[PDB]
């Protein structure tokens, strides 16, 4: 049936790595109960067969059983949605951008070596917006049922929490209680547990970037 190429853990080509875009695709397949074959790609040592179907070395790529491999996890989860419509993970267009600046604010703050450059405040602003959304519309981004936006956001919040605690001793404030309820719900899902990177691999993936 379907096949997906994802990043292997750095230093461990036999082990699932920490790409949040890869994990979004995997989470989507798991939540939809779609069988798939997973191919681990060492992105510092790509195989030539891989380069023939992904010439720019892009990961993830997805083959839905129609004789081609497509990149871009936005595009891939939409194709999966169209081909496997039940369970429905459609997120209403009015909530599509919820949480959309959190990952980049996180990466800027993670890499920041200046306590006064405002990167921390910018990240807290985006977390607070997520908190306000979940307080109005939760427990997931679209209310009682999980949807595509949650599966996009959860791998990203996982990086945020693991990397900021490890490298900066920083945690999401406890008063953001809806965000904490949200991450605890998502990260405890069997699909998430099955598809997440071990924390030491995720940390090893960020270490040279921090650095
Ligand atoms: Na390579």
Author numbering: 2 to 212
Sentences from the study reporting this entry:
DHAR catalyses the reduction of DHA to AsA using glutathione (GSH) as a hydrogen donor before the spontaneous hydrolysis of DHA to irreversibly form 2,3-diketogulonic acid. The structure shows that the asymmetric unit contains one molecule of OsDHAR and adopted a canonical GST fold, consisting of three β-strands and three α-helices in the N-terminal subdomain (residues 4–84) and six α-helices in the C-terminal subdomain (residues 94–210), although OsDHAR showed modest sequence identity (~20%) with GSTs.
Here, we present the first crystal structure of OsDHAR. Most of the residues were well-resolved, except for the N-terminal methionine residue. After inspection of the apo-OsDHAR structure, we predicted that the highly conserved Cys20 residue acts as the catalytic nucleophile and found that this residue is located at the cleft between the N- and C-terminal subdomains. In the apo-OsDHAR structure, the OG atom of Ser23 is 3.4 Å away from the SG atom of Cys20, which is an acceptable hydrogen bonding distance considering the rotational movement of the side chains of Ser23 and Cys20. Notably, the three-dimensional structure indicates that OsDHAR contains a broad, uncharged cleft between the α2-helix and the α3-helix as the putative binding site for non-native protein folding intermediates for its chaperone-like activity.
